[PDB]
Amino acid sequence: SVNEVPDYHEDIHTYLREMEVKCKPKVGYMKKQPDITNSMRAILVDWLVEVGEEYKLQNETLHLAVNYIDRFLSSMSVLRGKLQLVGTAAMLLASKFEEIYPPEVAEFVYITDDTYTKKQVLRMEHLVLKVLAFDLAAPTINQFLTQYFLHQQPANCKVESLAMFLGELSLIDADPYLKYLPSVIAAAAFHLALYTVTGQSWPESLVQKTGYTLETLKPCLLDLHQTYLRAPQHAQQSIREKYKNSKYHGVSLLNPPETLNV
Amino acid sequence: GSMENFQKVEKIGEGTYGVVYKARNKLTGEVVALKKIRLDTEGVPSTAIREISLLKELNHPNIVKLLDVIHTENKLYLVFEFLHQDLKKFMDASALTGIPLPLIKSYLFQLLQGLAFCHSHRVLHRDLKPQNLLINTEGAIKLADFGLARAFGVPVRTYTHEVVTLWYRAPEILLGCKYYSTAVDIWSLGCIFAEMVTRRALFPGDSEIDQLFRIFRTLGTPDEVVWPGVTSMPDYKPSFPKWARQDFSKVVPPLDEDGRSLLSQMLHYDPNKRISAKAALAHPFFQDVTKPVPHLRL
Ligand SMILES: COc1ccnc2[nH]cc(-c3ccnc(N)n3)c12
Ligand SMILES: [Mg+2]
8 A cells, every 4th residue: 555655666676776875884994084983873772772761763764863863974084982982872862763752852862861961961962963954854674675575575564573573784884884885784684684583585576676686695695694693792782672572572582693604 | 165155136935844935055056045053942843854854756747846055053055946926826827817727737746746856755844735836837736835845654553633724624634544555645635736727726724624615515425335444433433414425516616527537536545545745747637748837027
């Protein structure tokens, strides 16, 4: 039906494929940051997951915020004591763009444990907007996933929730996932979820839609499979905790496959 | 830039937003509209964030052009192309003669082009009403004011329930559907099509229930045959009166067979069956469409 916009689906997918390239963060930016590391970024993104949980934000909002952060850090050097300010402002902006009822600015001041003032959060909001030139309508892993889900025969909630879980795990680790586009991470996450739950693979209908095949997805899939296998041992755990919830069908309790047999 | 290059001419609009000025670029001569957005105690308004991000992406002849953003400590100015009038004022000026058919047809065709472009770029407008449709002296009409717009995903999620100015608001919003989609903007354009022909609002309700009852009196109270699932909608009531559907030629009597056909497809109850902007462009109503200038001085 119209909720799946049959007359525009293909146009939209094509437009998102153009925009994701335009909205892509610079892959090698962390090496150019003198004061911050992949580990510090991981801690930040894990905190943002907890924030999204506390205020019951859309997963889309979280994905947008990470996009804004990585793009901001692609051109702006930030000291370690200011990274959380960038993150808080990014999440505020993401909420304003995406949420029906975004949290108040004071609620964003509060969740930083008063590390920052309202004045600082608002000034950072302005700076982020300037650096990003107000270009906030960025494609996310989730915007591709929800389209890919329409290709299931039939729809399976465990598959959908598991794919979201995997896409979210990829947000934490700039190495390797900065090198992959959202549409590609989404494709690998969807295949890996489908395989884990049903034993089935990336369908021919999605090859038709995306031009991606298992061969072209292999690099990301190998990375994602390893992340999935290592998830219980990762220093950051907020996504696994989050995905134990019935809201996401407890999918983080599912066991990853030992091999992919590609 | 900018700013020191603009000479303000006069106030031309207001909203909340929001005030709009006509200005001229002192160096290039370009005439612009300056939409001023006042800042602060929650920082930059989500309506401004959405309008700017979306309008920056949307470059189309039938979509108002955002030229620049002047972003400073206390003020935000959006610099737009200037247009001479809105469709509501034009309808008012066209009392006694009406709007010539070739112009109604040209305007609808252009509105559909602008809308199909939004929908193809995953944007819902959500406030299509004559006041937000701007016209120039060369015969263009353009969608404006994207403060109420939203970038959607596929399939859609639940978005703000408001939404859309009451007279132009689709029955699926009025009945509280969990999901609404591109069809809501087509409903509004259907209302505007009728309004261009008659110069009066098709469904001028004063509350949500009155709005619904006015729609039902015109198009019939919808049942499970016309609109599968309607009786199960959150705000549907089995006690709704059951009005018969009118002879559709009585809704807008001066409209021809092809016009009536298109209007009926834009006002289809079932959002799944309602015509898309993209499909409407190929409707036989537009077989002889041209783009004449407005018949009146703006
Ligand atoms: C009263 O508004 C105008 C009058 C003349 N020309 C205009 N050009 C653009 C505007 C306009 C106003 C409000 N929102 C948006 N997006 N655009 C406008
Ligand atoms: Mg570094």
